[PDB]
């Protein structure tokens, strides 16, 4: 019928069974624990023993405790009521609003959608970031990748992409938090209640998003399957409902790391540099479930933390085959102070072809690639020469190229809480010819930084007008200034007579609810009969 935990090694525990062993990728439950604990079996030991992975911390499992079989894979409650809910890996409410108002639980482990039901019709997903929509154009229902180091600006692109595409769609979306910080988790909960994507009250059914959160605090059972828990509710809305759902998964690398933290612990030799031996079927099984079929559409948005901007590690080097549109973030362009710091060379999508979009889109983005590759091949030699002997034919594809690295920049709506400048929702054909102009020489007349953090071709000519005036401004130093006391300025002590009286009490309020109990001077132990005794005094 049921079995017992026989062995605990950190975050993997071993359950023995007396006949009819559970199928692989089923769910187990322990009774008498603090929280409900789900064990997901990964391999059979051989001696009537499954080997598990732990959805929460194992600190507390006694050897021999009762383990029941649910006989079935992990079931999350899918449904239309799940919108506006912050969801766990194992189906829990962690936003503390009752149970999940949904039915028809579904197995979150399945096979990939087959080869026959594959979509090849491609639609350009216009986002609103001038480096995305020109250079690496995303695909509707396709894949969106995001690499970059820890501190280059990956996650602030993701919520910016939510404000771009997940608001102006009307349908449903899903934010799949896989092992990121709670800070960028909790802040996104506030900036979707205020932006109205997630609602509270009796309007829970008209919302647009579910949040599946497997953040960094959980042990790697939960950080390894929150990718699948966020995935299957997106694949539930695809096949049953037909709506296009946007999957915003964060830190796909943390999905592959959470596998790799216990993959050695299940009895496997480490692979290349120390990552997991089975990363191919782990990630390849993850990715090809995220597609768009004949029945519906899933537009995957993937953020990946890469360690120290090195793309030779095999845990992101399997991901490059698995992403059509890739927005590779360079720390160098952020060290230039340019946001978004999207690489003009490393970030290249699959929509970029004149056989689909049109020659007017493909030629300027290729024209961007000529002027920016040669700018990289010349900024090595500009430090030996200083750009003074080039005979005025290589001083044209440089001066525009120093401008075009600023013309990838844009103030963000989600970032204006800490940058001050208001964000732009930029369209496509207005800036393609705008990108085309500064490549051609129509805007050679302008200075350097007028291109920085702007939008259309109207705002670049109007940053120079303000900039040109500001070189005519601050041309005075004499008198009639703020520094005199004649106009409105009080004396220095009459500021001080409006200060509010701040009380200091020196005892700080620390003995009001703290139950200042006593602790034992001698360590308390148990006896063989189990009752509490002090230590029997003998070595």
């Amino acid at each position: 019928d049921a079995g017992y935990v026989s062995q605990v090694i950190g975050p993997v525990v071993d359950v023995r069974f007396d006949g009819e062993l559970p199928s692989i990728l089923s769910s187990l439950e322990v009774e008498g624990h603090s929280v409900r604990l789900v064990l997901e079996v990964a391999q059979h030991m051989g001696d009537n023993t499954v080997r598990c992975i732990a959805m929460d911390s194992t600190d507390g499992l006694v050897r021999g405790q009762k383990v029941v079989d649910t006989g079935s894979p992990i079931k999350v409650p899918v449904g239309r009521g799940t919108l506006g809910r912050i969801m766990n890996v194992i189906g829990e409410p962690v936003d503390e609003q009752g149970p999940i108002d949904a039915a028809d639980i579904w197995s979150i482990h399945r096979e990939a959608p087959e080869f026959t039901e594959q979509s090849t019709e491609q639609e350009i997903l216009v986002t609103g970031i001038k480096v995305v929509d020109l250079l690496a154009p995303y695909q509707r229902g396709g894949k969106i990748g995001l690499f970059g180091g820890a501190g280059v600006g990956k996650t602030v692109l993701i919520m910016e992409l939510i404000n771009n595409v997940a608001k102006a769609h009307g349908g449903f979306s899903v934010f799949a938090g896989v092992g990121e910080r709670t800070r960028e988790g909790n802040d996104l909960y506030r900036e979707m209640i205020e932006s109205g994507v997630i609602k509270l009250g009796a309007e829970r059914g008209n919302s647009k998003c579910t949040l599946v959160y497997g953040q960094m605090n959980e042990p790697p059972g939960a950080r390894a399957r929150v990718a699948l828990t966020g995935l299957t509710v997106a694949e539930y809305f695809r096949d049953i409902e037909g709506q296009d759902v946007l999957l915003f998964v964060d830190n796909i690398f943390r999905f592959t790391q959470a596998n790799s933290e216990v993959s050695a612990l299940l009895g496997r030799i480490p692979s290349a540099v120390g990552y997991q031996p089975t990363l191919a079927t782990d990630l390849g099984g993850l990715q090809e479930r995220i597609t768009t079929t004949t029945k519906g559409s899933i537009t995957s948005v993937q953020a990946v933390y890469v360690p120290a901007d090195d793309l030779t590690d095999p845990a992101p080097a399997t991901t490059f085959a698995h992403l059509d549109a890739t927005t590779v973030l360079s720390r160098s362009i952020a060290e230039l102070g340019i946001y978004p710091a999207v690489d003009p060379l490393d970030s290249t999508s699959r929509m970029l072809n004149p056989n689909v979009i049109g020659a007017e889109h493909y030629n300027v983005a290729r024209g961007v690639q000529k002027v920016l590759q040669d700018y990289k091949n010349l900024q090595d030699i500009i430090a030996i020469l200083g750009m003074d002997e080039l005979s005025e034919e290589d001083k044209l594809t440089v001066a525009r190229a120093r401008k075009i690295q600023r013309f990838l920049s844009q103030p963000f709506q989600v970032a204006e809480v800490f940058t001050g400048t208001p964000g732009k929702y930029v369209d496509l054909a207005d800036t393609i010819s705008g990108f085309q102009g500064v490549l051609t020489g129509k805007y050679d007349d302008l200075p350097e930084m007028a291109f920085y953090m702007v939008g259309d071709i109207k705002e670049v000519k109007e940053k120079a007008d303000k900039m040109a005036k500001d070189i005519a401004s601050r041309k005075e130093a004499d008198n009639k200034k703020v520094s005199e006391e004649l106009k409105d300025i009080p004396s220095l002590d009459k500021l001080v007579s409006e200060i509010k009286e701040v009380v200091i009490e020196e005892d700080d309020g620390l003995e009001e609810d703290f139950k200042a109990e006593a602790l034992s001077s001698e360590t308390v132990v148990l006896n063989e009969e189990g009752k509490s005794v002090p230590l029997p005094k003998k070595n």
Partner: protein
């Protein structure tokens, strides 16, 4: 055989007193399997599919046969999985025959020296780093750089060549997709249908979504499909794409099966499992069938390291390298074929003699250009025996640019590179580029292309017309 321990797509079975090494077994729940290693007490069995169906104590039946794939002409146009089943949704594969995927390569006396050339449409491949019918050439590169593009534009060129070439010497395509997405192959099944190449192509696509040994077996079965076109005497093109993922396949099973790890945790014999693949495609001699087989493996590097362990093997067993760098790809030379890094072993020994007297200088003039390539970012001029060569190199960049999915016929790219090195070049400025590239290939009469494909070489009864035809380059857009 009963299963003791099963996990991660690896089932360790007990029993099976007569199972063979590499024998294809079958489980209870319809999923097949192969036993790779056979130990004293338990036998290790790798699993071709999902592994969450087998409990402990299930049963395995031996089929008594080493793993085989259905080979033959009925596979043409179908999209199969690597084990030998179709996934296209077009029902079964009829007019086929099953044959063993594991045999030995052709020996010494089976071989004949590769002399006649394969033509692959990309002029940067055909003229600079050429490829013979029955030859091994590695499309190495970065990712997002066009290794699939050099593969598929060769395939579309064969369909652009097979319609005007007789029945025997028609080059059939088996592009084997290893580790690509299940949605990328959907684009590739579209491009072979829309162009019409699906009369000639067999798309073996073991994805990233299936289990480990399917990605391991997809090159052997795909080369076993290439075995059928060899001993029938036809000519065949076999392409493995992203063979590094097949190395990720042979890594993933070896460490799961507790075989001893070697360099970068790959097994030691992974060089042998790459060689018996790539030594299977060759040119059989005129006593044993006369057919050929040319293999185009693909290795995806990381940042251009050609000394990584997996690339170290394939460069050693194959002949040359078509190095496709990502950085110079945005420098407009399409494909980014680093001629100083990309060599083929045969050189001019196996090239069509309409190119031989002009590729025999083209690797010499590009040698003069790459030795002087640091000067193009300098305005201060040298003696103009350098700077004319810098423009002889510059109009030999855009001389080699190839539009995507558009292979050009073989005798057209012969006279086009004849129109740059001989000196009928675009001396006027690069404001007008669009009528300086296409003018040679469109404004001459099409009698001259008919002659060059018949005789094999620019005879001296043609150069006076050919110098005259390039002289009246029209360019009506000036």
């Amino acid at each position: 055989g009963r299963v003791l321990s099963v996990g991660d797509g690896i089932a360790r079975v007990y029993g099976l007193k007569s199972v063979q090494a590499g024998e294809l077994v079958c489980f209870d729940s319809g999923v097949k399997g192969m036993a790779l290693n056979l130990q004293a007490d338990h036998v290790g069995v790798v699993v071709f599919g999902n592994d969450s169906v087998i409990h402990q104590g299930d049963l395995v039946y031996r089929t008594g046969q080493i793993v085989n794939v259905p080979i033959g002409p009925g596979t043409l146009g179908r999209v199969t999985d690597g084990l030998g089943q179709p996934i296209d949704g077009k029902g079964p594969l009829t007019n086929v025959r099953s044959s063993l995927v594991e045999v030995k390569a052709p020996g010494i006396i089976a071989r004949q020296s590769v002399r006649e050339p394969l033509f692959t449409g990309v002029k940067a491949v055909d003229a600079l780093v050429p490829i013979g019918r029955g030859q091994r050439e590695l499309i190495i590169g970065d990712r997002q750089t066009g290794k699939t593009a050099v593969a598929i534009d060769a395939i579309i060129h064969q369909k652009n060549c097979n319609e005007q070439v007789p029945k025997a010497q028609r080059v059939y395509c088996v592009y084997v997709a290893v580790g690509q997405k299940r949605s990328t192959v959907a684009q590739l099944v579209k491009l072979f249908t829309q162009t019409g190449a699906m009369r000639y192509t067999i798309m073996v696509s073991a994805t990233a979504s299936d289990a480990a040994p399917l990605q391991f077996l997809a090159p052997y079965s795909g080369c076993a499909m290439a075995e059928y076109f060899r001993d029938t005497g036809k000519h065949g093109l076999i392409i493995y794409d992203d063979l590094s993922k097949q190395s990720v396949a042979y890594r993933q099973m070896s460490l799961l099966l507790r075989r001893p790890p070697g360099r970068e945790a790959f097994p030691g014999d992974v060089f042998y499992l790459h060689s018996r693949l790539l030594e299977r495609a060759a040119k059989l001699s005129k006593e044993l069938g006369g057919g050929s087989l040319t293999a185009f493996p693909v290795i995806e590097t990381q940042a251009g390291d050609v000394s990584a362990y997996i690339a170290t093997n394939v460069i050693s067993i194959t002949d040359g390298q078509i190095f496709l760098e990502t950085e110079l790809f945005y420098k407009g030379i399409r494909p980014a074929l680093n001629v100083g890094l990309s060599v083929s072993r045969v050189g001019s020994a196996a090239q069509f003699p309409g190119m031989k007297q002009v590729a025999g200088t083209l690797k010499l003039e590009l040698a003069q250009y790459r030795e002087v390539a640091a000067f193009a970012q300098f305005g201060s001029d040298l003696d103009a025996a350098t700077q004319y060569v810098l423009e002889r190199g510059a109009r030999l960049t855009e001389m080699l640019k190839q539009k995507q999915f558009a292979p050009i016929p073989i005798e057209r790219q012969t006279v086009a590179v004849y129109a740059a090195t001989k000196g009928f070049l675009d001396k006027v400025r690069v404001q007008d580029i669009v009528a300086a590239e296409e003018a040679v290939i469109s404004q001459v009469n099409p009698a001259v292309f008919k002659i060059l494909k018949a005789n094999g070489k620019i005879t001296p009864a043609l150069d006076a017309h050919l110098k005259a035809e390039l002289r009246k380059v029209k360019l009506p857009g000036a």
